[PDB]
Design a protein around this ligand. Structure first.
Ligand SMILES: CCCCCCCCCCCCCCCCCC(=O)OC[C@H](COP(=O)([O-])OCC(O)COP(=O)([O-])OC[C@@H](COC(=O)CCCCCCCCCCCCCCCCC)OC(=O)CCCCCCCCCCCCCCCCC)OC(=O)CCCCCCCCCCCCCCCCC
Ligand SMILES: CCCCCCCCCCCCCCCCCC(=O)OC[C@H](COP(=O)([O-])OCC(O)COP(=O)([O-])OC[C@@H](COC(=O)CCCCCCCCCCCCCCCCC)OC(=O)CCCCCCCCCCCCCCCCC)OC(=O)CCCCCCCCCCCCCCCCC
Ligand SMILES: CCCCCCCCCCCCCCCCCC(=O)OC[C@H](COP(=O)([O-])OCC(O)COP(=O)([O-])OC[C@@H](COC(=O)CCCCCCCCCCCCCCCCC)OC(=O)CCCCCCCCCCCCCCCCC)OC(=O)CCCCCCCCCCCCCCCCC
Ligand SMILES: CCCCCCCCCCCCCCCCCC(=O)OC[C@H](COP(=O)([O-])OCC[N+](C)(C)C)OC(=O)CCCCCCCCCCCCCCCCC
Ligand SMILES: CCCCCCCCCCCCCCCCCC(=O)OC[C@H](COP(=O)([O-])OCC[N+](C)(C)C)OC(=O)CCCCCCCCCCCCCCCCC
Ligand SMILES: CCCCCCCCCCCCCCCCCC(=O)OC[C@H](COP(=O)(O)OCCN)OC(=O)CCCCCCCCCCCCCCCCC
Ligand SMILES: CCCCCCCCCCCCCCCCCC(=O)OC[C@H](COP(=O)(O)OCCN)OC(=O)CCCCCCCCCCCCCCCCC
Ligand SMILES: CCCCCCCCCCCCCCCCCC(=O)OC[C@H](COP(=O)(O)OCCN)OC(=O)CCCCCCCCCCCCCCCCC
Lengths: 505, 101, 175, 109, 149, 132, 124, 178
């Protein structure tokens, strides 16, 4: 009983959600600019900043809500579309349906909107992680730097255009557009003094990766004078060009999604960056490298052996997981966990368009929520005890017990109890790897799920237990409602997304 | 959209941005607001005409550049290729048929 | 317009069809397309873009179908284990069930693997199997809500066709 | 350079000047002696006196440019007309306001 | 399109009306108007002066006053004599530029590059294959600046 | 489609699949790549002719789809490597039914030019299977 | 350029060829030029209008519900909120409870009606 | 540039590279003039050593204008300086020069660090106070401010209007041989 109404519902919702967000951003920006002369906080009760804050929060939430309904529409649409071509067995008829255009708004950037499952998963992750991160940045924004309240709406708009285009050039441009806001946030909002050099490291590594990706994109564009993913079906690349392109895109996207030899920038940036932006960087930003690579991996025929890339990813996993024991800073430990699971996800895209991509797609969201939760816990500890080092804080239980309980439950979920999506993603990827490489699968499993887990658990257990004897005059209070609800929502999302529709994945 | 209105909108926001950047209040020197829109509207309106008129001459130029490329290719042939059967007929067409002057 | 990349290796190319001799390092954009980029990248290059999309979807459904076969035989084994005591389960299971279990093993059925390594002929055979099942179930109109989308008008015509076919099959003599 | 007739035609001897009035008068007279009889390939021997005047009046570079322009004009005339060109230009400028969509699931290739 | 009549005070405005954005024609390309004197000398251009070049000079004389005043707005530490002399110098320079423009206009009319009141016996047929400006000009002021859109 | 009817079947419409030879797939793919220009022109010609005399009052309404016939010939020749005939009417006895199916599915039933390619390809496949 | 109807006559072509190159009936040609062989432009326009209305209603109801929820439950601490609600007259409490739920539930109901096809006429 | 039966068909413009070079030169000049206008607003005697980039930390217009000018010089994607380098790499790939691409990549990354190194020196303890005084008060120029406003607009959003500049530059470059 699928008809045209659902098709047009899905398309209209996809386009109109973007225009909703854009009009919110434009109105709030106009109000901010034209209300005062200098555009800085007035430090009184009637500051425009207040309104702006609410506006931004409002919009994201509302857009997310619309997105959810929008997302559901797509699912049904996609499902039935497949059916409409699976059951067309008569040789005389063919599915020839041509749609119209909405008469209210123009197509942004003169392009036709096309969407896929992994793009909408990325958009949902952007929505949720941006909401959490902007909630975790209230205290950092103050006199003379309130403008960066607008950063996450800009991120949402850019990622929307990124995921809703079949233009490979606009794809690359939207991928490139994400650097300036990130650098500005690290430069102007971070409180630590060491963050000035960390931003430079972030910029230089990420831009080297972007330069490699740019070389590959220029290669593809010049050889095939086209900007559509479809036209690549009618042009063949020789062995040399295919090898050059695959190496360039792998290295360039592995600079951002940190492969083994390039994670120094990520470690420094997480150690020095503000907590909210750290949540955004681990939860969502690195995933932008997985998406683009996937697209460029799937549109080209490559006739090379993926053993070198698989070995690089596995070396990343082993190197990151072996370094967890000797970490006393909790934020660095969370960064290393992020590195190991990012490399695990990046491994799943080393077999092309095979069924290995489903585990990677699910584990991207799994890591997004796990990293958001871990960095939020680190932020709570840092704001409570004014430190994030095991040698300075322990016995988080017995004083503010809710934080300790959250730490222990986070450890359980990271260990991967069979009731959540971490176990599902591990099962997918490890089944495929065991069939593809048994000894490699065993080695990777032992290194990741035992040694790294033991180091992680030692560093986190020692902080939770003990006696907080040092400074009783300055000991803090327990969690607030905001932090409790954020942690509970992360747990709930993991457990309940273990129940998503099986048509996908 | 109209280029005249787009230019007028450009001048309006340019003046307000200049007032903010100089830390002078808005509503200061108000007569500059209509002047900026008038100047900016005429400026971008002429550019719209010039860019369209440059495409026309560029397209007509490529017709002449079409002829130059063919003759440059024949003159850049390596020696011994002029009478080769791959280029012999095309070379003779320009040397003989195009001797119409 | 499609372009190309200048080649470097020096090697003679013999075109017996056009009766010409070329060099790999002196190929223009068009000659590179018909001499170096002519290889196939599909299971069935003879199909159009629409036809290969249908073929690919049918192949995915066929892999899922073989996986479903294995799941069904496993569930039958579980039912036999619950319903039949071990004093006679092995012999009954050895009758007709063990062979089917071994028929749907790792090479024949993809299972939990990343990819089913099939040649183009194997993919064609799987797609043909799926299409045979479809033709069997389509002539009875069994796939309206579950695996299809017909209008109200088409439903009445389909019902009339299926009714006539069922009448024709019933009045035939037994084989 | 070194390949364009346009840049070579601008190269002249010292103390060499062109009388454009006489050259264009002779060229117009010759092209009106032609264009009354129409051929796919222009035959100057059918207009001998005007051909001689044109050769003695115009420089070699000017004559080469004139022949190239005449060939281009003859090629263009056989293919296009004013009304269909106007209609095509209007249609192209009208569809420029819209967008271009991919042709998903094609048939031709 | 229609151009200003020559040998009249508004003839110089035809300098701003063009058919193509080209600076110059090709070596063998025919000028838009018949040629009066291809190989003109200095006195040939002077003898061709008429009301249009004098109108160019008059326009230079009119517009030179605000330009000279605008230049003079930048003077400091000056006396009346120096200010008056500098104003006279700037005004005379603008007059000289107007005379140069009139000389160029007369030369162009002699060569046939601009409207000189003559028409070719045979029109050079042109097929408007590429057209991005006809309707835009017809719905604008720019139809005045274009000849045969 | 690559299903053959089952003869002496217990029920009415039972089919069995088959896979073409590697030579047939190669030939069809190469000819489709080398002759897709004619295929696109048929789609454009078919739509263009109706746009000019779709009404029955037009002067040349009687001719119908005649000029596109030329394209239909060229494609055929291309798809047959000029080894059989200059026009589709010279197709051998095998594949003649598929030619009628293509003509019915292309003009009498103005179907999207997705199903019509299947019948022309069937003509080519039948000719390839018969001859060599 | 050479694909036209000038110099084309039925004399050259044989009848059978003409029979396979003749136009279909008027209805088929009209459906072909209008591209309405399966669905009509009226169907498409109605679907666009319904999608427009559904999106506007859903977005408006969602924003109204969330604004009223935030502005009714963001007045202070728990005791302050309890005192304010107790001071509120009965209709005001009824409104500040009910109507955000009404807006959000109506948005969800509209979405559910959007995803379900219950207008199909092959029932019974 | 192929031939079929003595008919030549070419899909190459042959004058694109000159237009690309002109675009690179013009973009560099625009960004350079932006940063020099920012300098010319201020008191010139303060900028002697490289660490004195801190002197640009006076008020939000100067600081952000120079931060974005430096990022544009470094070739950061959104800004104007990126487009010229991107088109240079595209033209090099079109001309099939991978060694030139590699050497330009090395030069680009080293120069990018050379540019962004000064963003660390901009950090200052307090406001710099780098403005000239006139009539007892700081002299803030409005005309140079408006010029910087226009240059900032075309630095931020010049990638949207780059097509027209490319059209004009190719039109100019098409006259080279004709
Ligand atoms: C996209 C790509 C293409 C873009 C194409 C357009 C480019 C230009 C964009 C800006 C212009 C439109 C917005 C105007 C805003 C406005 O309201 O201004 C009023 C504002 C007036 O200020 P004010 O404070 O009200 O005036 C009182 C003052 O005391 C000052 O008064 P004063 O005492 O000094 O004297 C008065 C004088 C003061 O103003 C001036 O003197 C302006 C001079 C600026 C430099 C111009 C150089 C050339 C001048 C003309 C040459 C001669 C031509 C023939 C003239 C007649 C000769 C007899 O005039 C005015 O005040 C009124 C303005 C009259 C002149 C307007 C000229 C606009 C030219 C725009 C195009 C330029 C480039 C063309 C390239 C080719 C295109 C086909 O104008 C200015 O302050 C100057 C504006 C300068 C505009 C041009 C240059 C902008 C460059 C921006 C950076 C672009 C880089 C990237 C480009 C490529 C990107 C991909
Ligand atoms: C024409 C009709 C059209 C519609 C037709 C129907 C369509 C239906 C469609 C479906 C609709 C679904 C609902 C839509 C959303 C709107 C609902 C709404 O606004 O309701 C509230 C609204 C009124 O609410 P209220 O009285 O103002 O109180 C809410 C205050 O804002 C706040 O009150 P408060 O702050 O004064 O009091 C706080 C209280 C208020 O309660 C709430 O705020 C409830 C929401 C709490 C959310 C978080 C709870 C924890 C979640 C944990 C998840 C699992 C985590 C672990 C996973 C593994 O919170 C609690 O009691 C917290 C719950 C206890 C949590 C304990 C957690 C322990 C740890 C568990 C995990 C351990 C392992 C780790 O409802 C109505 O007005 C009903 C109208 C009925 C009208 C009938 C006709 C007349
Ligand atoms: C496509 C998006 C490309 C974004 C490229 C980019 O990174 O632009 C930098 C630019 C940085 O602007 P900003 O951080 O506000 O700069 C503060 C001023 O430098 C300092 O602000 P202020 O308070 O000193 O006032 C001056 C400011 C006043 O104007 C503004 O603040 C407007 C800024 C947005 C335009 O005007 C300007 O900075 C020049 C405005 C020129 C255009 C005027 C119309 O970012 C954007 O414009 C954001 C675009 C978001 C697009 C979302 C879709
Ligand atoms: C015409 C100029 C429009 C732009 C200037 C402007 O309205 O600035 C806001 C100015 C006020 O900004 P302002 O910069 O003059 O004042 C400083 C800021 N406050 C108001 C907080 C003291 O005017 C208004 O907001 C009133 C509405 C516009 C009135 C003129 C309409 C025509
Ligand atoms: C206020 C102070 C101003 C400057 C004063 C000091 C500088 C003086 C410069 C020389 C002045 C004297 C020149 C004597 C020769 C010309 C005499 C004259 O006016 O003859 C009129 C005659 C006018 O007649 P005609 O040129 O039309 O024709 C000659 C006569 N028939 C018809 C017989 C052929 O000649 C000229 O006007 C010729 C001008 C030639 C100008 C050449 C400039 C070359 C520049 C090269 C620059 C390279 C870089
Ligand atoms: C704080 C305030 C809320 C901010 C967030 C929600 C903003 C919703 C839109 C508010 C109005 C925005 C006006 C912008 C300027 C304008 O004129 O917009 C008109 C535009 C339609 O374009 P138009 O000019 O008609 O030209 C045709 C091509 N677009 O657009 C329109 O005609 C409006 C419809 C645009 C597309 C849908 C956008 C979202 C609609 C949400 C509806 C419910 C909002 C309730 C309040 C929140
Ligand atoms: C209210 C509305 C009423 C109705 C509308 C009324 C409108 C009336 C006013 C408009 C008409 C007035 C007359 C025409 C405008 C004045 C002349 C002018 O601006 O000319 C632009 C100039 C012309 O050159 P062109 O014609 O190409 O010359 C070749 C042979 N003629 O063109 C050029 O110089 C060519 C381009 C030069 C190179 C540009 C590209 C490279 C540089 C790009 C970046 C520039 C950045 C800044 C550089 C410094 C300049 C500020
Ligand atoms: C960092 C900046 C990188 C810039 C891009 C250029 C990188 C070097 C490319 C070298 C190259 O293209 O060499 C040509 C050569 C062609 O090999 P050929 O013999 O034609 O065929 C393969 C069968 N032997 O190619 C080869 O033999 C293989 C080329 C790819 C080698 C792996 C990837 C290297 C890094 C890119």
């Amino acid at each position: 009983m699928f008809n045209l109404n659902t098709i047009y519902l899905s398309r209209i919702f996809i386009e109109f959600n973007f225009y909703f967000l854009f009009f919110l951003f434009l109105i709030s920006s106009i109000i901010f600019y034209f209300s005062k002369i200098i555009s800085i906080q007035n430090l009184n009760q009637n500051s425009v900043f207040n309104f702006l804050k609410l506006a931004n929060i409002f919009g994201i939430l509302i857009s997310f809500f619309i997105h959810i309904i929008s997302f559901w529409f797509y699912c049904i649409y996609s499902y039935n579309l497949s059916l409409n071509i699976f059951s067309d067995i008569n040789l005389y008829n063919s599915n020839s349906i041509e749609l119209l255009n909405n008469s209210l708004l123009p197509n942004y950037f003169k392009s036709n909107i096309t969407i896929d499952f992994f793009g909408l998963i990325l958009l949902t992750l952007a929505y949720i992680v941006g909401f959490v991160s902007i909630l975790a940045l209230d205290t950092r924004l103050y006199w003379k730097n309130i403008k960066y309240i607008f950063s996450f709406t800009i991120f949402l708009l850019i990622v929307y255009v990124y995921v809703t285009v079949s233009n490979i050039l606009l794809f690359f441009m939207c991928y490139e557009l994400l650097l300036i806001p990130s650098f500005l946030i690290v430069y102007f909002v971070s409180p630590s003094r060491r963050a000035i050099q960390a931003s430079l490291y972030f910029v230089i590594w990420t831009q080297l990766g972007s330069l490699l990706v740019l070389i590959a994109i220029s290669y593809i564009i010049s050889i095939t004078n086209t900007y559509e993913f479809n036209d690549l079906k009618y042009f063949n690349f020789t062995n040399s060009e295919s090898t050059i392109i695959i190496f360039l895109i792998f290295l360039g996207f592995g600079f951002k999604a940190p492969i083994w030899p390039f994670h120094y920038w990520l470690t420094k940036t997480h150690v020095e960056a503000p907590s909210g932006f750290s949540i955004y960087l681990s939860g969502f930003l690195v995933k932008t490298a997985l998406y683009g690579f996937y697209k460029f991996n799937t549109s080209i025929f490559i006739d090379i052996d993926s053993s070198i890339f698989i070995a690089i990813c596995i070396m990343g996993v082993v190197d990151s997981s072996l370094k967890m024991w000797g970490q006393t800073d909790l934020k660095k430990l969370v960064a290393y966990g992020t590195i190991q699971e990012m490399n695990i996800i990046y491994l799943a895209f080393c077999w092309g368009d095979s069924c290995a991509i489903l585990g990677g797609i699910l584990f991207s969201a799994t890591h997004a929520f796990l990293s958001a939760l871990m960095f939020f816990l680190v932020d709570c500890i840092y704001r409570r005890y004014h430190t994030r080092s095991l040698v300075e804080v322990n016995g988080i239980l017995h004083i503010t017990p809710n934080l300790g309980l959250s730490i222990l439950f986070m450890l359980v979920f990271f260990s991967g109890i069979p009731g959540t999506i971490k176990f599902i993603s591990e099962f997918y990827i490890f089944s495929g790897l065991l069939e593809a490489s048994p000894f490699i699968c065993f080695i990777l499993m032992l290194v990741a799920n035992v040694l790294g887990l033991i180091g992680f658990s030692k560093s986190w257990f020692n902080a939770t237990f003990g006696m907080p004897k040092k400074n009783t005059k300055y000991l803090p209070m327990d969690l607030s409602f905001k932090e409790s609800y954020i942690i509970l929502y992360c747990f709930f999302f993991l457990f309940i997304f273990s129940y998503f529709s099986s048509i996908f994945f | 959209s109209s280029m005249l209105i787009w230019g007028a909108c450009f001048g309006l926001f340019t003046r307000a941005a200049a007032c903010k950047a100089s830390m002078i209040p808005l509503t200061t020197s108000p007569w500059k607001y209509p002047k900026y829109m008038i100047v900016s509207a005429v400026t971008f309106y002429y550019f719209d005409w010039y860019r369209r008129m440059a495409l026309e001459q560029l397209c007509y130029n490529e017709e002449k550049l079409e002829r130059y490329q063919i003759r440059a290719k024949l003159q850049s042939l390596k020696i011994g290729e002029e009478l080769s059967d791959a280029y012999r007929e095309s070379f003779f067409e320009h040397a003989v048929q195009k001797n119409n002057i | 317009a499609f372009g190309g990349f200048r080649q470097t290796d020096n090697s003679l190319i013999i075109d017996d069809r056009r009766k010409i001799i070329l060099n790999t390092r002196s190929l223009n954009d068009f000659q590179q397309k018909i001499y170096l980029r002519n290889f196939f990248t599909n299971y069935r290059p003879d199909l159009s873009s629409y036809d290969y999309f249908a073929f690919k979807e049918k192949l995915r459904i066929g892999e899922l179908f073989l996986n479903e076969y294995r799941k069904r035989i496993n569930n039958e084994v579980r039912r036999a284990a619950i319903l039949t005591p071990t004093s006679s389960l092995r012999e009954k299971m050895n009758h007709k069930i063990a062979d089917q279990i071994l028929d749907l093993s790792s090479p024949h059925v993809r299972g939990a693997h990343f990819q089913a390594v099939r040649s183009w002929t194997d993919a064609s055979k799987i797609v043909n199997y799926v299409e045979e099942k479809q033709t069997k179930i389509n002539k009875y109109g069994l796939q309206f809500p579950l695996l299809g989308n017909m209008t109200e008008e088409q439903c009445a015509s389909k019902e009339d066709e299926v009714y006539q076919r069922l009448l024709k099959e019933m009045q035939k003599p037994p084989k | 350079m070194e390949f364009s007739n346009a840049l070579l035609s601008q190269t002249k001897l010292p103390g060499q000047q062109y009388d454009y009035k006489r050259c264009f008068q002779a060229s117009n007279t010759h092209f009106e002696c032609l264009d009354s009889i129409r051929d796919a390939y222009d035959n100057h021997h059918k207009c001998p006196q005007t051909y001689q005047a044109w050769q003695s009046s115009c420089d070699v570079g000017i004559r080469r440019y004139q022949m190239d322009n005449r060939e281009q004009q003859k090629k263009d005339q056989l293919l296009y007309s004013k009304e269909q060109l106007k209609n095509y230009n209007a249609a192209k400028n009208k569809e420029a306001y819209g967008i271009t969509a991919p042709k998903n699931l094609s048939f031709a290739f | 399109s229609q151009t200003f009549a020559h040998d009249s005070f508004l003839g110089g405005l035809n300098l701003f009306k063009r058919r193509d954005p080209r600076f110059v024609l090709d070596q063998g390309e025919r000028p838009p108007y018949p040629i009066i004197n291809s190989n003109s000398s200095f006195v040939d251009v002077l003898s061709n002066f008429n009301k249009a070049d004098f109108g160019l000079v008059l326009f230079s004389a009119a517009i030179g006053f605000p330009l000279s005043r605008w230049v003079l707005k930048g003077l400091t530490f000056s006396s009346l004599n120096y200010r008056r002399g500098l104003f006279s110098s700037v005004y005379g320079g603008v007059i000289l530029w107007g005379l140069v423009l009139g000389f160029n206009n007369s030369y162009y009319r002699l060569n046939g590059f601009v409207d000189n009141g003559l028409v070719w016996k045979r029109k050079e047929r042109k097929l408007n294959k590429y057209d991005f400006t006809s309707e835009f000009e017809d719905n604008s002021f720019f139809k005045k600046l274009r000849i045969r859109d | 489609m690559f299903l053959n009817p089952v003869k002496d079947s217990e029920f009415d419409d039972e089919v069995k699949g088959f896979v073409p030879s590697e030579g047939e797939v190669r030939f069809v793919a190469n000819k489709n790549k080398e002759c897709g220009y004619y295929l696109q022109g048929i789609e454009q010609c078919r739509r263009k002719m109706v746009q000019l005399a779709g009404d029955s009052s037009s002067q040349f309404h009687s001719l119908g789809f005649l000029p596109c016939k030329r394209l239909v010939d060229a494609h055929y020749r291309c798809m047959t490597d000029d080894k059989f005939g200059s026009t589709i009417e010279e197709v051998p006895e095998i594949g003649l039914d598929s030619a009628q199916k293509f003509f019915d599915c292309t003009f009498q039933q103005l179907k999207p030019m997705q199903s019509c390619r299947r019948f022309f390809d069937q003509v080519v496949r039948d000719v390839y299977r018969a001859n060599g | 350029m050479n694909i036209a109807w000038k110099e084309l006559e039925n004399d050259a072509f044989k009848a059978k060829d003409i029979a396979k190159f003749s136009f279909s009936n008027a209805s088929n040609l009209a459906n072909f030029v209008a591209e309405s062989q399966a669905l009509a432009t009226n169907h498409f326009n109605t679907a666009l209008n319904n999608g427009f209305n559904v999106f506007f209603a859903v977005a408006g109801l969602l924003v109204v519900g969330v604004l009223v929820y935030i502005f009714f439950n963001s007045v202070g601490g728990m005791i302050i909120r309890s005192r304010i609600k107790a001071a509120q007259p009965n209709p005001n409490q009824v409104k500040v409870l009910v109507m955000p739920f009404v807006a959000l539930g109506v948005s969800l109901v509209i979405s559910r009606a959007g995803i379900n096809g219950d207008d199909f006429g092959y029932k019974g | 540039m192929s031939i079929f039966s003595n008919i030549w068909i070419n899909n190459d413009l042959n004058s694109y590279g000159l237009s690309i070079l002109l675009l690179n030169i013009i973009n560099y000049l625009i960004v350079f003039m932006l940063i020099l206008s920012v300098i010319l607003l201020t008191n010139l005697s303060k900028f002697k050593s490289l660490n004195q980039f801190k002197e640009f930390n006076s008020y939000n217009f100067i600081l952000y204008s120079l931060i974005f000018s430096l990022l544009s010089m470094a070739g950061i994607p959104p800004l104007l300086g990126f487009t010229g380098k991107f088109l240079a790499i595209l033209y090099s790939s079109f001309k099939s020069q991978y060694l030139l691409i590699l050497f330009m990549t090395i030069l680009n990354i080293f120069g990018m660090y050379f540019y962004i190194q000064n963003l660390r020196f901009v950090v200052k303890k307090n406001k710099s106070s780098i403005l000239n005084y006139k009539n007892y008060y700081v002299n803030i120029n409005y005309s140079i401010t408006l010029n910087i406003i226009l240059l900032n607009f075309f630095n931020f959003f010049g990638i949207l209007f780059l097509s027209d500049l490319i059209i004009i530059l190719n039109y100019i470059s098409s006259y080279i041989y004709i």
